[PDB]
RNA sequence: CUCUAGUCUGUUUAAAAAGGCAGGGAUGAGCUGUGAAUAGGAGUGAAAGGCUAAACAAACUCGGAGAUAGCUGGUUCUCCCCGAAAUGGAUUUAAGUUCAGCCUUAUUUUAGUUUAAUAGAGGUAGAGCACUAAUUGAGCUAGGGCCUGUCAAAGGGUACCAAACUCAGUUAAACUCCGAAUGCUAUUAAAUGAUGAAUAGGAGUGAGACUAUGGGCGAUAAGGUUCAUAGUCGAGAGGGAAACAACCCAGACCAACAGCUAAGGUCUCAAAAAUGUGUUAAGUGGAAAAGGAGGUUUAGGUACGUAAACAGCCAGGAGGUUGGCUUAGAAGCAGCCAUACCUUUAAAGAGUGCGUAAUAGCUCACUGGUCGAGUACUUAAGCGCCGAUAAUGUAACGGGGCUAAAC
RNA sequence: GGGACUGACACCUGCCCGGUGCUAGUAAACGGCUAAGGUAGCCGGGUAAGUUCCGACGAAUGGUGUAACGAUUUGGACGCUGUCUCAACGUGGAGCUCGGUGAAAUUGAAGUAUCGGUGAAGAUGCCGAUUACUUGUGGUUAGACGGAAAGACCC
RNA sequence: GGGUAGUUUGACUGGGGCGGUCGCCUCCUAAAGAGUAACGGAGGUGCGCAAAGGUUACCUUAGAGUGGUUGGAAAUCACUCUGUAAGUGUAAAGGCAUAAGGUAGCUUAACUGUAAGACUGACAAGUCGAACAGAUACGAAAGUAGGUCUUAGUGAUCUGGCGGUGGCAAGUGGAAGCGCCGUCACUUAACGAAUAAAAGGUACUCCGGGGAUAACAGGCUUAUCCUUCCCAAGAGUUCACAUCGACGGAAGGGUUUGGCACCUCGAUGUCGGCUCAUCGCAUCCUAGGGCUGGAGCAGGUCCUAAGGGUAUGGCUGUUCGCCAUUUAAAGCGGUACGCGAGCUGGGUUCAGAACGUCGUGAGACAGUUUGGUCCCUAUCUGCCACAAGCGUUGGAUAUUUGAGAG
C-alpha cells in the first residue's frame, strides 16, 4: 500500500478517534470560563491545566506574563481589561474559579 | 479551440484555487445552467468537447452560452529532462472554476431535452455538475 | 536551454522609519522613499531624494487632505 | 637442448607465475657455460609506458624528516550550575575560515516581553473594472470586402470581416476607483521578577530535518528542491498512535508497595462501563475516484386519488388516410416536412416497439370495467452496495473474536 | 656515415606554397583536397530456416593485386567422434570411519525460528501471528547487504 | 629554444562535464513595517548633457467630436467634450497641476572650510541633513542654488606620473627622495580584485575522503508506459451499446523510459546463457458458461477458474525481433529486470594493436574489429537425510486407528 496514502490514512484515523465525552467536558469548561470572563472587577483564581510544551510562542509568552509556569499553578488576579485580554488569549489552557 | 489571442506574459504561476464562487454564479443569458460542484480547472479542449455535445444534441432549438474562457497557460517541461533550467513551456490552456460557477447556459429548448443535452455535456467535464432551471421562474 | 533571466537588485529598505505619534528630535529621518509618496507639512523638510526629515523636536503626525498624506511635526 | 599458442589442474596451491597434456624453433636473427662493460630525470629496450636484484609513468638505502594535509581516525576519573547554532555578510568560497547573531563567566547598569486603551503607515487576502490588458452575449455603428442600375465618377442591399459607443455578465503575481483581519511602531496604566542593555574574558556553530500554515519550481507528483511563521526532534526521558527520532499528551534532584488526572481507552488477550434513544445486515465499521443504482432511516416538493389513483386482468385501441411525399415499394414504424388532420369522439399519436423487400400481422400510449389507497417522478440529511484489482502466507480492526464488544 | 619515412615482389603513387617547418623555392615535409575542392583504384549464392560470411575510403601516416608462408582472425564442406538428445558403468587420487601429528583467514558477544508489517527506507534481535522435544553427523549455500582488497568506476 | 626545469589553467551547477552565469539598477515572486531563496518570471545598464545645470519670470498636453488649399484616419490651425491617460535625455517603478512638463532672460552653487542630528548596516562602505564662515550667481526682496525629478552609468589597497605647498634633510649647509594637499593611469567584467606576468590530457595513473555526489539495484512519486472504467456521436442494410465503439473523463498496476539523491563507495560484482525453480492472474491451451450480424463447422466478444502443460532449430553476445518445421496450445509479470561464496566470459567495463572521426599535438569517441586470471576447506540461521539422549506416569515387546504433511 502506497506510503503517501497510508500516512494520510493513519493521521486521519488518529484525528478522528476523539471521544465525544471528552469533547463535552472541554465544552463545559470553555462555557464556564467564558461566563467568568464576562464579569468585571472581581478577584479570579487561575489554574493552569494544559502544558506549555508545543504551544505557540506568543501564547507561552502570555502565560508566563500571567505568572503560570507549570500545570497546577495557582494565581489570583484582579480582572481588569489587561487580565481579561490575556485570559481571552489563553482561555483554552486555564481553569477560572472565583475568589468570594 | 478557445484561447486568448494575445498575452502580456506567456507563463504564470500556478496559484492555489479554493473557496466557493462569489461571482458569475447566477443564470444570466439563458434558461438552464450547468453549475459545478467542485473547484478545479477545465481545459479549453474539454470545454469545446462539451460544447459540441450540447450543440449537436440540440437540433437548432436554441442557443448555448459558454461562461468560462481559459486564459491560463499550463506549462510542462520536456519529456525526459531533469529539474534544472526552469519554466519549460506552454502546453495547453486551463480555465478556473469554483463550486457554484454557472459554466454553461442554454436557451430555447424544452426542459427535458435541455436536461438530457446537459447531462451529455457533463459526461465530458472533470467536475461534478448540477443542472439547474432558474428556480425562480418555473 | 538555460534560464534567460534571474537578476535582482539589492533591497533598498524604504518605508516609514518613525511611526505617527513618536517623539523625534531635530534632523531625524522619518520616511525613505522614491517620490513624494508622503508630502511635506509643517516643520519638516524634503531631501534631494525625497527623504522626509524633522526640522525640530516634536511628535510626528500624518494628515490626509484630498487623498494625499502629509507629514508634520507637532 | 631452448621457448609457450590452445586447454586443464592449481589459485587460504607443491611453485609470490608451476605442473599435466601439446605446440614452435631445432646449422642459426641459434642455444648456453665462464669473465667483463653501460646506474636513477640515468642506463637499456627487434619498442609492450618493458626491464634494471620476486614491487618501476622515474630503483634502493641513509639523511633532511616528526615534510605538508581545508581529509579520515583517536583523545583516558567524578559531581554541580547555566546553556547553542545548523542563520545573515564576504571569500580561488561551496567539506574550510572570518565578522555579526546565538552561548557562558565577571562587573556595571535597569526596562525586555506580554496585553488593554489610544494614536500611526499598507495594498496582502478579498473585492472590483475607474487605469493598463484579456474577454462573452445583444443593441448600435465607422471602416474594409462582396453583391446590386457598379467602366476606376458621384450611388444602394449589408448574410459578413469590425474600430468606437450602450446594456448585461466575467479574467489578471508584475491591472487597483476601494480595502481588511493579523502583524509592525509609539505612549500610558497594570501584570510578570534578573528574561534587557553595556564593557571585559572564553568558545562553539556557519550541512539541518519534519509537522501545522502562506509560497515558488515540479506534473495544484514525490520522505523532492528552495523561502516566511510556530512547534518538535536535533540536544528530550515518560504515556498514547499495534511496531514506528519529527505527530498527540507531557519537561525526569533523589526515594516511596500513596492519591487525583492529560492524551488514549474501558469484551478479552491487556490496567479501564454501564444505561437510554436511533441507524447499520454490508462484518460496513476495519482504505479510495467518476459513475451506475425501486438499499434503508428521516424530512421536504411535484404528479395523483374514495367523484374510483397505480399494477394486474377482461375489451376498445377506429375511419377519412399509401398523411403529403423522397424512393422502385414507405401503407404508423430506409429517410424528409408536421401531427396550425378534423371527425363517431368512451378513447385512439400524421402510431411506442418487434417483425415484414412494401404491406400484412402481433403490441403500446390513451380509454372503459374489476378491485381497492396510496401510487409516480425528484430534492435534503445519516449509514450502506457494486465500482474495489498483484506477486514468500489470511495480511487495509494489532489478534482472538464481535450484529455490538459498530456508529 | 647519421636521421626520418615506407616495407618482398607487380601495376601506380595525381592536385594545392595560403598556414606551419626547412634553405621565393621545397609536399617521398608537417597538412589540406578557397592556396588548391580527390586523379587512378576501391540483389545473387549458400542453409528446410543465415543481424555472420562470400559475390555485386583513398593514393610513401601509402592505393590496388600477388606465388609461397602462419601455435593469426572468419565462413563452408568431407571424415571422425559422449560436444549434444542422455546419461550410465568402471578405474586412480581426495572425500567417509579409526589411530598419530596438526593449521588458516574470521571472530562485540548468541538459551540466532518463520511469515505478514514497521523502521537510516532489503529484520536472527521490534509489533502481531504462526511453527518448533534436546543435542550431533554427513550433504548443499538461500541469508547473515559473507570473508579477502580505507572501490580501481564517479566526484 | 618543451632540449630541459619549476607552475598555472576558477566557482556556482538538482552528480560531473557541456552550455549558461558572476557588478549594479526597476517590478513581481515577497504572505499589507523592514527583511526574505531559486539555473523563478520580465527589462535596462559600465552613459549623455556647458544645458538636458542653477535662478527668476511666464505657460499646458494626449485623445474623441466638428470645420478648413495641398491634408487622406492621421501633418498645421480654430472650437466643444474630456482633466493627465500627454510629457519628464536614457530601463522600469515610485512621483510630478504649485507641475519635477514647456518657453524666455540672466548666470555658473557642476563652490571652499565645515557640520548638529540619523537611516541603512558583520566590518569595510553608502546615503540624507537643518544650520555656521568666506566668496558668489539669480531675484526688488524674502529665499533658492554644495549638478542632472528621484532610484543604475562603476573599482579597494599597493606601485608609478603630473601640479601646488615647503613638513622631513642620517656632522652641518644644499640637493636627491619622501610626507602633506589637488589629481591621472587596472573589461582587476571571476567586478570586496590571491601574481606585474599562465593552456590541455591521464582508459598507465596514484594518494587522502565522501552515499555531503553519478552509474547497477533498494525506497518514494507516476510524468511516461501498460491494464481498465465512465459518456455514445456513428459504423454495422434499418439496429448508440453482436462487434468496433470517434472527440473527452475518472482510476489502478509500480514491469518500460524518467524524476528525486533517502540506504550502500575500510567494495550491495553489471548484460545474456546453462542448471534449478517458486509466486501473482490482468488465462496461451485443456474445463465450466452468457451473447452474437452464432445454420452446422470454424469463430468473435464477455464472465468464472492458476490443477497441469505451455516446443525444437537457422541468424544475432544478444533480451527483444525475424525466419523454418511443429504442437490442443508454444501466455503475460514478480522474485537484487529470480538464481556467478552453483557454472559459462560472448558482450559490457583495464593495460596491446588497427580502422573511422575530432583535436596542432599529447589524446578523446554508449564508432568498429581482435587478444585479454572469475578467488575462498561453511561458524550460525535455512533446507535435504541419518542417529544419540529423553519423555509419553509400572516397565517392555508387537500389531495399528489417525490429527497433520507430502
PDB file of C-alpha atoms (C1' of nucleotides) in Angstrom, chain D residues 6 11-13 17 41 48-50 57 69 71-72 88-95 99-100 122-124 173-174 176 180-184 207 214-217 219 221-228 288-291 334-335 389-391 393, chain F residues 5 9-12 14 27-33 35-38 40-41 122 190 192-194 204 208-210 212 220-223 229-230 238-239 250-254 258-261 279-280 282 333-334 351-353 372 375-377:
ATOM      1  C1'   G D   6      45.419 -23.627 -27.011  1.00  0.00           C
ATOM      2  C1'   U D  11      44.806 -20.428  -7.233  1.00  0.00           C
ATOM      3  C1'   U D  12      43.875 -19.871   2.490  1.00  0.00           C
ATOM      4  C1'   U D  13      48.399 -24.024  -4.153  1.00  0.00           C
ATOM      5  C1'   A D  17      53.858 -17.377 -12.052  1.00  0.00           C
ATOM      6  C1'   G D  41      65.285  12.595 -14.565  1.00  0.00           C
ATOM      7  C1'   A D  48      54.615  -3.792 -24.906  1.00  0.00           C
ATOM      8  C1'   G D  49      54.782   3.179 -20.709  1.00  0.00           C
ATOM      9  C1'   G D  50      59.066  -3.092 -20.766  1.00  0.00           C
ATOM     10  C1'   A D  57      54.760   6.639 -15.634  1.00  0.00           C
ATOM     11  C1'   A D  69      47.375  17.999   4.703  1.00  0.00           C
ATOM     12  C1'   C D  71      40.981  14.632   4.677  1.00  0.00           C
ATOM     13  C1'   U D  72      39.897  10.466   7.902  1.00  0.00           C
ATOM     14  C1'   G D  88      22.901  36.583   7.611  1.00  0.00           C
ATOM     15  C1'   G D  89      27.503  39.166   5.056  1.00  0.00           C
ATOM     16  C1'   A D  90      32.107  38.142   2.439  1.00  0.00           C
ATOM     17  C1'   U D  91      35.738  34.868   0.286  1.00  0.00           C
ATOM     18  C1'   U D  92      40.294  30.813  -5.819  1.00  0.00           C
ATOM     19  C1'   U D  93      34.293  30.383  -1.106  1.00  0.00           C
ATOM     20  C1'   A D  94      30.577  25.646  -1.636  1.00  0.00           C
ATOM     21  C1'   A D  95      33.537  19.515   3.291  1.00  0.00           C
ATOM     22  C1'   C D  99      32.662  39.027  11.174  1.00  0.00           C
ATOM     23  C1'   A D 100      27.636  39.531  13.067  1.00  0.00           C
ATOM     24  C1'   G D 122      -0.165  49.369   3.979  1.00  0.00           C
ATOM     25  C1'   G D 123      -2.051  47.302  -0.712  1.00  0.00           C
ATOM     26  C1'   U D 124      -1.912  41.119   1.065  1.00  0.00           C
ATOM     27  C1'   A D 173       1.819  37.899  -9.027  1.00  0.00           C
ATOM     28  C1'   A D 174       4.415  42.050 -12.332  1.00  0.00           C
ATOM     29  C1'   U D 176      -6.248  48.603  -8.482  1.00  0.00           C
ATOM     30  C1'   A D 180      -9.433  44.202   5.882  1.00  0.00           C
ATOM     31  C1'   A D 181      -8.376  40.524   9.805  1.00  0.00           C
ATOM     32  C1'   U D 182      -3.383  39.849  11.942  1.00  0.00           C
ATOM     33  C1'   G D 183       1.397  41.748  12.209  1.00  0.00           C
ATOM     34  C1'   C D 184       4.709  46.216  12.850  1.00  0.00           C
ATOM     35  C1'   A D 207      25.459  20.637   6.146  1.00  0.00           C
ATOM     36  C1'   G D 214       1.405  31.017   3.476  1.00  0.00           C
ATOM     37  C1'   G D 215       4.560  30.232  -1.275  1.00  0.00           C
ATOM     38  C1'   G D 216       7.644  29.483  -5.698  1.00  0.00           C
ATOM     39  C1'   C D 217       9.664  25.494  -9.003  1.00  0.00           C
ATOM     40  C1'   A D 219       3.282  17.393 -13.094  1.00  0.00           C
ATOM     41  C1'   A D 221       3.535  14.196  -8.335  1.00  0.00           C
ATOM     42  C1'   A D 222       7.386  12.761  -4.996  1.00  0.00           C
ATOM     43  C1'   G D 223      10.216  11.245   2.671  1.00  0.00           C
ATOM     44  C1'   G D 224      11.680  16.405  -3.952  1.00  0.00           C
ATOM     45  C1'   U D 225      14.037  21.383  -4.272  1.00  0.00           C
ATOM     46  C1'   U D 226      14.079  26.453  -2.253  1.00  0.00           C
ATOM     47  C1'   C D 227      11.680  30.826   1.240  1.00  0.00           C
ATOM     48  C1'   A D 228       8.199  33.005   5.565  1.00  0.00           C
ATOM     49  C1'   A D 288     -10.002   5.353  -2.068  1.00  0.00           C
ATOM     50  C1'   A D 289     -12.447   8.165  -7.584  1.00  0.00           C
ATOM     51  C1'   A D 290     -16.047   9.346 -11.508  1.00  0.00           C
ATOM     52  C1'   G D 291     -20.420   6.698 -12.421  1.00  0.00           C
ATOM     53  C1'   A D 334     -34.755   3.217 -45.311  1.00  0.00           C
ATOM     54  C1'   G D 335     -35.345   8.782 -44.509  1.00  0.00           C
ATOM     55  C1'   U D 389      -7.756  -5.060  -8.654  1.00  0.00           C
ATOM     56  C1'   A D 390      -0.524  -8.359  -7.918  1.00  0.00           C
ATOM     57  C1'   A D 391       3.179 -11.367  -6.825  1.00  0.00           C
ATOM     58  C1'   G D 393       1.267 -16.887   3.941  1.00  0.00           C
TER      59        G D 393
ATOM     60  C1'   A F   5      63.084  22.523 -15.200  1.00  0.00           C
ATOM     61  C1'   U F   9      44.637  26.563 -16.176  1.00  0.00           C
ATOM     62  C1'   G F  10      38.182  29.195 -11.076  1.00  0.00           C
ATOM     63  C1'   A F  11      33.430  28.694  -8.838  1.00  0.00           C
ATOM     64  C1'   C F  12      28.102  28.188  -8.811  1.00  0.00           C
ATOM     65  C1'   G F  14      19.212  19.377  -8.620  1.00  0.00           C
ATOM     66  C1'   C F  27       8.955  45.319 -10.906  1.00  0.00           C
ATOM     67  C1'   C F  28       6.730  40.698  -9.328  1.00  0.00           C
ATOM     68  C1'   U F  29       7.579  36.257  -6.682  1.00  0.00           C
ATOM     69  C1'   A F  30       7.689  38.609  -1.112  1.00  0.00           C
ATOM     70  C1'   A F  31       2.402  36.045   2.704  1.00  0.00           C
ATOM     71  C1'   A F  32      -0.295  44.729   3.523  1.00  0.00           C
ATOM     72  C1'   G F  33       6.975  47.619   8.802  1.00  0.00           C
ATOM     73  C1'   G F  35      13.997  41.882   5.553  1.00  0.00           C
ATOM     74  C1'   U F  36      13.286  37.134   2.851  1.00  0.00           C
ATOM     75  C1'   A F  37      15.805  31.851  -1.672  1.00  0.00           C
ATOM     76  C1'   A F  38      15.995  29.608  -6.627  1.00  0.00           C
ATOM     77  C1'   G F  40      11.854  31.839 -10.613  1.00  0.00           C
ATOM     78  C1'   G F  41       9.169  35.263 -14.241  1.00  0.00           C
ATOM     79  C1'   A F 122      29.237  41.854  10.347  1.00  0.00           C
ATOM     80  C1'   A F 190      35.858  35.658 -11.929  1.00  0.00           C
ATOM     81  C1'   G F 192      35.317  43.081  -1.577  1.00  0.00           C
ATOM     82  C1'   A F 193      40.110  42.347  -7.073  1.00  0.00           C
ATOM     83  C1'   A F 194      45.314  35.506  -4.251  1.00  0.00           C
ATOM     84  C1'   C F 204      49.299   3.725 -17.414  1.00  0.00           C
ATOM     85  C1'   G F 208      43.698  11.395   1.200  1.00  0.00           C
ATOM     86  C1'   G F 209      37.899  11.108   1.694  1.00  0.00           C
ATOM     87  C1'   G F 210      32.723  11.297   0.690  1.00  0.00           C
ATOM     88  C1'   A F 212      27.623  15.545   1.569  1.00  0.00           C
ATOM     89  C1'   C F 220       9.347   7.493  -2.881  1.00  0.00           C
ATOM     90  C1'   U F 221       6.278   9.520  -6.979  1.00  0.00           C
ATOM     91  C1'   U F 222       3.655   8.079 -11.554  1.00  0.00           C
ATOM     92  C1'   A F 223       5.210  12.325 -15.995  1.00  0.00           C
ATOM     93  C1'   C F 229     -13.791   2.042 -16.371  1.00  0.00           C
ATOM     94  C1'   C F 230     -17.482   6.306 -17.318  1.00  0.00           C
ATOM     95  C1'   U F 238     -32.616  -0.161 -40.805  1.00  0.00           C
ATOM     96  C1'   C F 239     -30.337  -1.647 -35.272  1.00  0.00           C
ATOM     97  C1'   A F 250     -12.339   9.232 -13.842  1.00  0.00           C
ATOM     98  C1'   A F 251      -8.556   5.261 -11.552  1.00  0.00           C
ATOM     99  C1'   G F 252      -5.445   1.103 -10.738  1.00  0.00           C
ATOM    100  C1'   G F 253      -0.909  -1.664 -11.602  1.00  0.00           C
ATOM    101  C1'   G F 254       4.783   0.134  -9.900  1.00  0.00           C
ATOM    102  C1'   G F 258      12.477   9.018 -16.215  1.00  0.00           C
ATOM    103  C1'   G F 259      12.282  12.330 -11.675  1.00  0.00           C
ATOM    104  C1'   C F 260      14.369  12.670  -6.790  1.00  0.00           C
ATOM    105  C1'   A F 261      19.749  11.610  -4.492  1.00  0.00           C
ATOM    106  C1'   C F 279       4.601 -16.970  -6.809  1.00  0.00           C
ATOM    107  C1'   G F 280       0.661 -13.493  -8.740  1.00  0.00           C
ATOM    108  C1'   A F 282      -4.646  -8.896 -15.854  1.00  0.00           C
ATOM    109  C1'   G F 333       4.722 -10.494 -14.869  1.00  0.00           C
ATOM    110  C1'   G F 334       7.130 -10.532  -9.947  1.00  0.00           C
ATOM    111  C1'   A F 351      46.785  -2.198 -19.642  1.00  0.00           C
ATOM    112  C1'   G F 352      48.013  -4.469 -26.620  1.00  0.00           C
ATOM    113  C1'   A F 353      47.086  -3.353 -31.736  1.00  0.00           C
ATOM    114  C1'   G F 372      42.839 -10.118 -22.793  1.00  0.00           C
ATOM    115  C1'   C F 375      39.469 -16.437  -5.509  1.00  0.00           C
ATOM    116  C1'   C F 376      37.545 -18.650  -0.566  1.00  0.00           C
ATOM    117  C1'   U F 377      38.172 -26.245   3.338  1.00  0.00           C
TER     118        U F 377
END
